[PDB]
Amino acid sequence: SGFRKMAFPSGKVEGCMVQVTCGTTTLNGLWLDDVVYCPRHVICTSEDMLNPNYEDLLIRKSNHNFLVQAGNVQLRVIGHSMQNCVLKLKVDTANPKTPKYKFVRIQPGQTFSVLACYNGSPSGVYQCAMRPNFTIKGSFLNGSCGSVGFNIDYDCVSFCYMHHMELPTGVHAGTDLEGNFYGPFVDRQTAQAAGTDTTITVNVLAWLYAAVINGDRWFLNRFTTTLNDFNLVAMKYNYEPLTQDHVDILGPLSAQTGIAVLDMCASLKELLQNGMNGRTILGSALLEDEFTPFDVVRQCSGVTF
Amino acid sequence: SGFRKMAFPSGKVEGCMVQVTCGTTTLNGLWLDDVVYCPRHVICTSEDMLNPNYEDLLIRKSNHNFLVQAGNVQLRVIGHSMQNCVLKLKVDTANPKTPKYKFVRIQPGQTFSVLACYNGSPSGVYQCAMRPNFTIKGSFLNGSCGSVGFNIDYDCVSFCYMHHMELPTGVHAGTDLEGNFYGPFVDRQTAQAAGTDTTITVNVLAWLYAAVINGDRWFLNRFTTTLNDFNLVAMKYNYEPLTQDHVDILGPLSAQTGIAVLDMCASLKELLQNGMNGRTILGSALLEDEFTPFDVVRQCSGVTFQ
Ligand SMILES: Cc1cncc(CC(=O)N2CCC[C@H]2c2cccc(Cl)c2)c1
Ligand SMILES: Cc1cncc(CC(=O)N2CCC[C@H]2c2cccc(Cl)c2)c1
Ligand SMILES: [Br-]
Ligand SMILES: [Br-]
Ligand SMILES: [Cl-]
Ligand SMILES: [Cl-]
Ligand SMILES: [Cl-]
Ligand code: NA
């Protein structure tokens, strides 16, 4: 029993973290086989960040301008190029600890684990969700750029996020490992802001199923609703629309508990309209939206890697 | 910016997890050097759990009654002994991935990372606090016994917890790595239950300091308190007494924010009286007590957002 915000074990990713320094900037890189991936803004000074021409800034750098350190060992850079907002440094040594991996781009609402890193050394691991506004509510300080997000499936690490920046509200933005930004953000020092966010409805429903699996059932009721009626309430409360694909993805949790998704939607509609009346769900006074349906099944069934 | 329940990177502990089977029971063990540590109840059947005599159950076992598997490799058991509630299986091969480590028995209020495992394989990692009633609020299913808790401050793994059981309220109990239970619990199926729990006051104050470092002061007020008056109030809300040792450990956070510890105590007394009035603190609508002062310093900026 119990239900915690659980991260994936991070060992396979720890063995990939290195430090990358270019000029006065030091950040983290991901070393897979003979390539080190990191944010391309490592090549910029503060003045360059105001209006960077990355192609011209990179033409001016040589391989020797990048110092890459894996623990106490210097890896020699033998080539460099950019793929979108990611710099790729070819090194003379392949990482002997490279796991089986893929680069995957995720959608808003999906969760992943972050291995927060400073100076190429892993510091901590936590789980989070990609918000509907494409930001992440991470925990990052200066020097954390290049820290990555991932999921595991069996023995394969799926890397999905590389950290690039903090926005004025203290939330974070970054790219996939092919260097494509999540959200309408750029790697330039200009006015940028997180857009208005919404709550991930399918995830709140998944977490209400986790609460029923754990014995918290006070919010269940005799009513059902329709997908149309529920979506009119979701829009009013700044919740994402629930689609038939979301109803299908909640299928396994609905089958395990015996509670139809539209029956659980009637519970959520009443919680949105009335509040919790001084009660909690799984120890929380807020409706939690950073567990996907698969996260609940994994945790409640003890899936291992 | 941001503030999350942050666990230590688990790799150094993942390389120590193994599966131990005795009879029909399979659970996890921790392989360090040439010893595998696991809960001694691996030798019990369900009926043995009502009134087990562990000395009598163990004398009937040979080394070859223990099967230990590290990934796809079987490790040969060459000796066994019991230390309190932990079985120590000597194996013929030392773990080549043994990290620098120590064993530490912690106090209530201290936090640690848990690597929850099944069949010797990791499922996930999360942070826990040792509650004042000597339980932990984990996430563990049958088969998770032998999963461990640890901290990794300064590249050395300090193992502080080994999981043994779930109590009737769904909370968890276990031992240190010398096999002594935290709390009054026993590895026997008795009517034992978690005592009434209390809130870890020093941790709530540390987390209010984290909120100020991260830029929020709305909950402060113009008052101060004596330590005794604060404790008389706090105990009425089932908060643990705050000691002078707790006030000392909050010193660095007080220095960084310019808020005297007894002035943050006056803020907490007012938050217990008023609630948050629709606001949140670090994303929470409830007062959080599973971050220690050391955990706040570990995670937060050393520069306050004034
Ligand atoms: C506190 C913190 C936490 N996470 C990351 C950072 C890094 C950050 O925001 N940087 C670094 C260069 C200047 C700035 C930036 C500005 C604009 C676009 C980008 Cl990609 C980057 C800081
Ligand atoms: C769901 C779950 C989560 N965590 C661990 C367990 C294991 C558990 O509670 N066991 C196993 C043997 C019988 C029982 C027990 C009973 C009494 C004392 C001890 Cl040490 C152990 C179960
Ligand atoms: Br301690
Ligand atoms: Br909450
Ligand atoms: Cl940086
Ligand atoms: Cl009703
Ligand atoms: Cl078990
Ligand atoms: Na209903």
From Swiss-Prot, chain A:
Cytoplasmic side: 1-305
Places the protein is found: Host cytoplasm; Host Golgi apparatus; Host nucleus
Consequence of substituting residue 142 to A: Does not affect ability to cleave and inactivate human TRMT1
Annotated consequence of substituting residue 189 to A: Does not affect ability to cleave and inactivate human TRMT1
Activity regulation, per record: Inhibited by pyridone-containing alpha-ketoamides compounds 13a and 13b. In turn, alpha-ketoamide 13b (tert-butyl (1-((S)-1-(((S)-4-(benzylamino)-3,4-dioxo-1-((S)-2-oxopyrrolidin-3-yl)butan-2-yl)amino)-3-cyclopropyl-1-oxopropan-2-yl)-2-oxo-1,2-dihydropyridin-3-yl)carbamate) inhibits SARS-CoV-2 replication in human lung cells. Inhibited ex vivo by michael acceptor inhibitor N3. Inhibited ex vivo by compound 11a and 11b.
Cross-link (Glycyl lysine isopeptide (Lys-Gly) (interchain with G-Cter in ubiquitin)) at residue(s): 5, 90
Domain Peptidase C30: from-to ranges: 1-305
Positions annotated as active site in the UniProt record: 41, 145
Stated consequence of mutating residue 132 to H: In strain: Omicron/BA.1, Omicron/BA.2, Omicron/BA.2.12.1, Omicron/BA.2.75, Omicron/BA.4, Omicron/BA.5, Omicron/BQ.1.1, Omicron/XBB.1.5, Omicron/EG.5.1
Catalytic activity: TSAVLQ-|-SGFRK-NH2 and SGVTFQ-|-GKFKK the two peptides corresponding to the two self-cleavage sites of the SARS 3C-like proteinase are the two most reactive peptide substrates. The enzyme exhibits a strong preference for substrates containing Gln at P1 position and Leu at P2 position
UniProt function note: Cleaves the C-terminus of replicase polyprotein at 11 sites. Recognizes substrates containing the core sequence [ILMVF]-Q-|-[SGACN]. Cleaves and inactivates human TRMT1, preventing tRNA guanine(26)-dimethylation of tRNAs. May cleave human NLRP1 in lung epithelial cells, thereby activating the NLRP1 inflammasome pathway. May cleave human GSDMD, triggering alternative GSDME-mediated epithelial cell death upon activation of the NLRP1 inflammasome, which may enhance the release interleukins 1B, 6, 16 and 18. Also able to bind an ADP-ribose-1''-phosphate (ADRP).
Assembly and oligomerization: 3CL-PRO exists as monomer and homodimer. Only the homodimer shows catalytic activity. Interacts with host FBXO22; this interaction promotes the proteasomal degradation of nsp5.
Protein name: 3C-like proteinase nsp5
Organism: Severe acute respiratory syndrome coronavirus 2
Residues of the full protein shown: 3264 to 3568 of 4405
